[PDB]
Chain A
Amino acid sequence: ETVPVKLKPGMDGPKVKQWPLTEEKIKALVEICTEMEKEGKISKIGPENPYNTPVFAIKKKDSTKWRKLVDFRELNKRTQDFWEVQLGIPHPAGLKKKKSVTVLDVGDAYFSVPLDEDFRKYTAFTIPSINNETPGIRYQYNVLPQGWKGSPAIFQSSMTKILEPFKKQNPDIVIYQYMDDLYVGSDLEIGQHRTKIEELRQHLLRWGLTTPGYELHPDKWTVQPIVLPEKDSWTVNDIQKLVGKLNWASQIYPGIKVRQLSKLLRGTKALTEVIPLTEEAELELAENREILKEPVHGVYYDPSKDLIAEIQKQGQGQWTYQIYQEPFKNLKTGKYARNDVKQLTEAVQKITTESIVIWGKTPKFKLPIQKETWETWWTEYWQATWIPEWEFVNTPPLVKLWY
């Protein structure tokens, strides 16, 4: 039998409007949805279904075939209770300590489990049409949809049975699926890790489960600490830029002081005037430098609170990001190095993958991009089977001074 699913009390299913899609994406969606309907995975619905979740088409990594990407973010929010409390998937704290972490895709196995009859209504999506020529094609899921956070919650009972022989045969390999992927971490040589991943793929194929950003190395992940300029000659402009940077950083590191550095900017001086740092000023600068290299002390992950990711466009293809739950409490600060939209999409996907590997939870992204440009072009470079919750903000001019 199916697993009954109920939305949060007093809350109604998603009614998110479908973003316009291109002709090729619409054709790909039409063909794949016709195939799915023939296979019974989805069914056509009438107008009596007020719920809708936007559906996009993407091309997965190293693949030319199109893939459907239903944006179940609203449905995920509305099933939060169900899929987090009563069928939650524990996150292994040792996945981030593994030399290699490969990311398999196992969402095709969800289509073997029927969806709750009373919940299929909310898993409703529309394929748009060009120029509103014809009404959008409305579909509805008859099986556990990909991208819904309750699909892994319902399928984990089967997944544990599938993986039990594998895990017993080698208990040193950490497996963890978040929504549709299967993060497999091990401390083996990349050749041996690939061999064991092939063995796991054969194991999944034996148990019916199918499987085709992909290989991760959380062992070689380091934070991007704040670095002060290292100059032999200091100008008034340089010293006051340093003082501003340290004053901002003091909101993060209580031990940062600017007293002796600010004591150098005593009078009204030219920005190009060269000021030789005093003994006290040099010592305090050294102390600030030593305080800054180490990570902040007292910042701990709170599973109750949502993760927030801020990204700054540093220019020249370089991006800096910070992951935090409270302001000035960065859990992780890093840098992404390579088209601004493509680079931002790649940065967002990498940051989300790191967040999944570390805390098993995607963050909320404050994207330094105009909202229309992102909603227009993000699907042109997206390759993940999941979609993180994002908002669009205007990066302060002085916050781009993370490097």
Chain B
Amino acid sequence: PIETVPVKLKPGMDGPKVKQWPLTEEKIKALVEICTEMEKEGKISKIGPENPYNTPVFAWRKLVDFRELNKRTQDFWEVQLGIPHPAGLKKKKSVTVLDVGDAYFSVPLDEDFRKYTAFTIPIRYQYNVLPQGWKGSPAIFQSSMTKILEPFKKQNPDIVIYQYMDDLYVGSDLEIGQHRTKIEELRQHLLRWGLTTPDKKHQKEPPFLWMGYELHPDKWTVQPIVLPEKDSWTVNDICKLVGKLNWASQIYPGIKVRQLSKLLRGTKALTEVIPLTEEAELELAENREILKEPVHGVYYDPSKDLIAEIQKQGQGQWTYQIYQEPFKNLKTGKYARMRGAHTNDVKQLTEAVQKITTESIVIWGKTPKFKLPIQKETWETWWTEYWQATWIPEWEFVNTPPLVKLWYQLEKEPIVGAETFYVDGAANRETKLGKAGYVTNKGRQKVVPLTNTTNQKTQLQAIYLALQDSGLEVNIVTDSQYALGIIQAQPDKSESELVNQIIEQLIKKEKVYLAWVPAHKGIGGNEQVDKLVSAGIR
């Protein structure tokens, strides 16, 4: 009695005509038996002459393929792109899980669209219900089940029902007997629509082994993460390990994945043994030690406040815990993404805070209170002196050892009594070699030949040379907007070794003023350094 969803093919298109796969001897009998069983059940009907279509079916089950029909049918709007997180589930006193036996098969199919699902075997059958694997079946089933549950959901505000693909997570704050009575009422309501569900001695008890999680009455976790303790490591093994401990990272805190992922850079073969780096081995040992003891999450409590605490563990790595009560956290996570070739600790912390904010809004629909390892003065300085509209919500300072700070600052005005370095760098595209150097108002000069370098690399090398050859206070004048912007971003770590050298040398310097002057305008010392480094490039 479920109202069918009106579906139609894409404009100016007709159902596919695909010949049967090469299977007519062994699986044919099983397919015929399955088709007869479905026809007896009423989910399958026979139409031979007036159904000029066909689809490729291959079996035992009958896995009918709708690859062609999927692209010939009008698109739907799926909403459940993601999956519910156990941390977002509300702590309910009693929880029952109902599986919908024959989920799709209980939802009828549009009468006009039934023909396009022709089902011919070496007979001509057509689906009367939602086919399996069809593009429209998931959305149609989800909408039909939402419609079916609406009368029950409205009449039972206390009962919470989360619908997955074919699973009903029914949670209630009622006593065991009342919850069982309501569950039987829900089962009868579903049966009124033909959706059969298991009875008392057919229902699955907890833990619920669901989508990689282990849902307990008052806690949640993941299935045991047994990492492969082997000597060799192929790219396939590294990918499997990274995925396994990325799954665990949402509950297990302190998980690091940077060296393991870095090992996957440039790899081409799926079996190429990788020389696990010493850093990677140490990180893997740390992850094993973290996974040694079990960790369980808690369910969301809307009455309490949602706190998010972030910790810096070095190498551009961040771990956060989201909790409401101390030492009992809903879920954990990590943020190691490097947004841009250059970044500093404060920008990375802002990105992590934004990621956690979006993640919490997705799971809990509310931003959490942030407990960040950054002083209020540091954040004030950064976001006041920064050119972006950076902002983090209400947050509280936590005095942890790995405090987030800025390791160097560029002077706002030239340093009186310091030395000025006019740095330039020229690169020859053809030969790929170039030069970098500097000139100083004191009268000094220096040009260092480079090789296999670009113009930007030459500019950075010139700046690095000036920093090396200058005292603790230096005025550096450059004509490269690229390097000027990089240095003014105040990066702490970079993907370039040269930029990291520049960063450490800036940290060494007590005062560093970086000025910019337009190139080729004949501005004092800039033209001199350009003439110096232009002999072999221009």
Contacts and interface: CB of A to CB of B under 8 A. Distances in A.
B475 A47 contact: no
Given A22-B367, A397-B485, A262 B389 contact: no
A2 interface: no
Given A47-B140, A52-B77, A397-B488, A369 B525 contact: no
Interface residues of B, number: 79
Interface residues of A, number: 69
Given A20-B362, A50-B77, A131 B422 contact: no
B515 A126 contact: no
Contacts of B440: 268
B524 A268 contact: yes
Contact of B162 (A134, A138, A262, A267): A134
B148 interface: no
Interface in B468-509: 475, 477, 481, 484-485, 488
B365 A130 contact: yes
Contacts of A135: 79-80, 142-143, 146, 163
A21 B366 CA distance: 8
Interface stretch (A85-93, A205-213, A240-248): A240-248
B384 A316 contact: yes
B327 interface: no
A343 interface: yes
Contact of B388 (A247, A268, A370, A372): A370
Contacts of A103: none
A128 B7 CA distance: 24
Contacts of A315: 384-385
B389 A271 contact: no
A268 B361 contact: no
Nearest to B347: A370
A367 B367 CA distance: 23
Contacts of B363: 130-131
A131 B7 CA distance: 29
Given A47-B139, A135-B146, A243 B389 contact: no
A341 interface: yes
Contacts of A270: 414, 419-420, 441, 475
A267 B525 contact: yes
B402 interface: no
Interface in A337-389: 339-341, 343-344, 367-370, 372-374, 376-377
Nearest to A131: B88
Interface in A5-35: 15, 20-24, 26
A271 B354 contact: no
A118 interface: no
B291 interface: no
B389 A376 contact: no
B318 interface: no
Interface string B425-452: 0000000000000011101000000000
B200 interface: no
A374 B357 CA distance: 12
B49 interface: no
Contacts of B391: 339-341, 373, 377
Nearest to B488: A397
Q: Which of B5, B358, B391 has the most CB of A within 10 A?
A: B391
Interface in A130-174: 130-136, 138
Contact of B389 (A21, A51, A367): A367
A344 B8 CA distance: 46
B77 A132 contact: no
Given A134-B162, A367-B389, A244 B516 contact: yes
A272 B390 contact: no
Contact of B364 (A23, A52, A394): A23
Contacts of B513: 271
Contacts of B517: 240, 243-244
B522 interface: yes
Nearest to B419: A270
A204 interface: no
B389 A343 contact: yes
B83 A269 contact: no
A372 B355 CA distance: 8
A248 B481 CA distance: 13
B523 interface: yes
A373 B362 contact: no
B481 A126 contact: no
A53 B274 CA distance: 47
A398 B516 contact: yes
Contacts of B351: 370, 372
A237 interface: yes
B198 interface: no
Contacts of A397: 387, 481, 484-485, 488, 516
Given A266-B524, A267-B524, A397-B488, A131 B6 contact: no
Interface of A: 15, 20-24, 26, 46-52, 124, 126, 128, 130-136, 138, 235-237, 240-241, 243-244, 247-248, 258, 262, 265-273, 312-313, 315-316, 339-341, 343-344, 367-370, 372-374, 376-377, 394-398, 400
Given A313-B387, A396-B481, 17 more contacts: A23-B364, A46-B143, A47-B139, A48-B6, A131-B365, A134-B146, A134-B163, A136-B79, A236-B524, A237-B413, A243-B521, A272-B415, A272-B475, A341-B391, A376-B357, A397-B484, A397-B485
12 contacts: A22-B366, A131-B84, A131-B362, A265-B524, A268-B524, A269-B525, A312-B387, A313-B386, A315-B385, A344-B389, A369-B388, A370-B350
In the A-B complex, list the 8 residue pairs whose CB atoms are closest, starting with the nearest.
A131-B88, A23-B365, A47-B139, A268-B525, A265-B524, A271-B414, A369-B389, A340-B389
